Ligand SMILES: O=P(O)(O)C(O)(Cn1ccnc1)P(=O)(O)O
Ligand SMILES: O=P(O)(O)C(O)(Cn1ccnc1)P(=O)(O)O
Ligand SMILES: [Mg+2]
Ligand SMILES: [Mg+2]
Ligand SMILES: [Mg+2]
């Protein structure tokens with residue numbers, strides 16, 4: 143049933159590509175650039191969970207009266223959903239380079255491809271351009287047009303501030319254990335993930351449904367930002383303890399000296415002895431040293447600490463839904479929470 | 485006199501930075517990210533010619549009635565001028581990485597700096613965010629607000645398509661002499677430079693003056709796109725024949741197998757013998773091979789061919805100003821042409 147709503151949305155990706163590559167119908171000079179764009183979209187916006195873009199569609203259907211859910215209104219809903227998918231695609235293409243990653247979504251990272259390399263920096267910028275190209279082609283004559291443009295622009299800046307904080311707390315070749323606090327961690331994830339992966343899709347659907355009130359968005363934000371914090375903590379857990387055949391990506395957080403939730407929890411439980419083991423093995427490419435950190439996390443029963451956090455966080459998010467979902471259907475936040483909590 | 489209009493605009497960069505880094509006044513958690521933003525702006529938006537942003541200010545003063553040139557209207561003019569400077573800054577930070585450059589504006593490229601590296605990909609994205617942050621803070625309640633947003637978004641996409649075409653015609657380790665044509669060359673530069681360096685600043689001033697007519701913009705475009713084509717040809721000439729103490733940047737076009745104006749002209753004049761010399765020495769990091777290409781360009785009197793092109797192009801642009809400047813003051817295009825033709 144949830145895979146059926148997924149399949150309908152996925153079947154629309156062909157048209158999304160068709161309208162984004164129809165610029166060569168009038169301008170054949172930019173043909174090769176248009177062909178390369180199709181290649182970038184096909185490689186980086188397909189093979190994922192589609193949970194971010196699908197949230198836009200699900201939330202639209204739950205917030206708009208079926209009497210106002212015509213064919214054009216629905217096409218605008220899946221198109222904006224696919225704009226959210228492009229925002230993630232563009233930020234992940236860049237993230238894989240800056241995180242020096244190997245795989246994403248079951249295949250090697252776009253930049254690791256022979257013949258691509260650092261040309262992927264411009265490929266990511268092209269993916270970002272498509273958001274605003276689609277918003278113009280489908281929402282240009284809608285009352286929420288500017289609200290959508292500003293929400294995608296603001297969400298991008300918040301992610302970028304978050305990415306800056308992520309990279310400044312993780313300098314390659316520097317011991318940053320002192321700076322790996324819970325307070326720092328909470329600030330990083332609020333900006334790098336919680337805004338663009340959780341607030342952006344529901345807020346886009348809210349603007350498309352005519353719900354533009356600062357109070358309604360502020361109350362939605364209270365739930366979704368906390369949901370985003372958990373989602374990033376889960377991403378950090380699975381970076382080391384997940385199955386790359388399931389996650390589709392190889393972990394790099396220990397090697398990259400990252401301010402992971404795991405290392406924050408490690409520093410809160412580590413003896414003076416265990417603090418030095420971490421200090422000497424964290425942030426290095428050596429497989430021997432990465433293994434020593436994974437062993438220390440397992441000694442401090444961090445996979446168990448995570449299972450307890452997930453239970454406590456689900457109860458917390460649920461408490462916030464009861465407090466702030468109104469006047470929106472609780473199903474809006476409940477639907478996404480069920481899909482996020484495994 | 486032209487340096488006086490420059491100095492006033494430059495003196496406003498301090499406030500541009502102050503308003504872009506006042507986000508930590510309310511949110512001290514993102515402080516370190518805000519400090520890094522200030523560092524990126526200070527390093528990459530200062531030390532240039534400021535000719536792109538200054539064109540916005542000059543064109544505003546020439547198109548708006550002095551009776552309507554109040555303090556607020558003028559602040560919006562220098563702020564939009566500085567938005568054009570941020571668009572160039574963000575595209576050049578990325579370009580230096582993809583072109584594997586050494587210096588820009590007298591100093592080493594932002595990415596070549598110890599401790600920066602590929603973190604500069606996110607630094608470039610932050611520079612792009614500031615355009616829309618400034619447009620919101622100063623033009624949000626203006627009738628041209630959406631026109632500006634759409635003009636900067638469209639200009640970015642056109643540059644990106646251009647950058648794609650630039651990089652696809654220049655694959656590292658591949659002989660692309662066959663593809664280095666005048667027709668290809670004209671398409672690359674139209675998109676990578678002519679739109680964002682020439683059309684964007686005058687069009688921004690036109691929208692701010694209330695001139696939004698498609699016919700007026702189409703006629704402006706006819707002049708400015710041709711002006712941009714010459715500016716890129718000049719940039720390609722100076723890549724090899726310019727003085728890095730003047731240009732502030734080291735040439736990489738031969739090493740990068742680029743579709744330069746020089747190599748297009750070389751292929752039009754080269755004997756079968758000279759074609760093979762180029763084939764064996766172009767696109768390689770070897771200083772010996774780069775030198776062999778420079779020698780062949782000098783043998784075919786390409787610095788003389790350039791001097792003839794500059795004369796013919798200036799007469800051409802001047803012919804187009806007489807044909808399409810009306811109903812705008814000819815000074816608008818004449819001012820920029822004098823500043824571009826050396
Ligand atoms: O762990 P990251 O923050 O780097 C990641 O979650 C991506 N990302 C980037 C910003 N927010 C999330 P991914 O593990 O997918 O590589
Ligand atoms: O020669 P490029 O096109 O790479 C350059 O002109 C920059 N640029 C990039 C797009 N348009 C212009 P620069 O020589 O400054 O490195
Ligand atoms: Mg990553
Ligand atoms: Mg990352
Ligand atoms: Mg991760």
Ligand SMILES: [Mg+2]
Nearest residue numbers: 579580583585
């Ligand atoms: Mg360059």
Ligand SMILES: [Mg+2]
Nearest residue numbers: 579582583650
């Ligand atoms: Mg370049």
Ligand SMILES: [Mg+2]
Nearest residue numbers: 719720723737
């Ligand atoms: Mg150049």
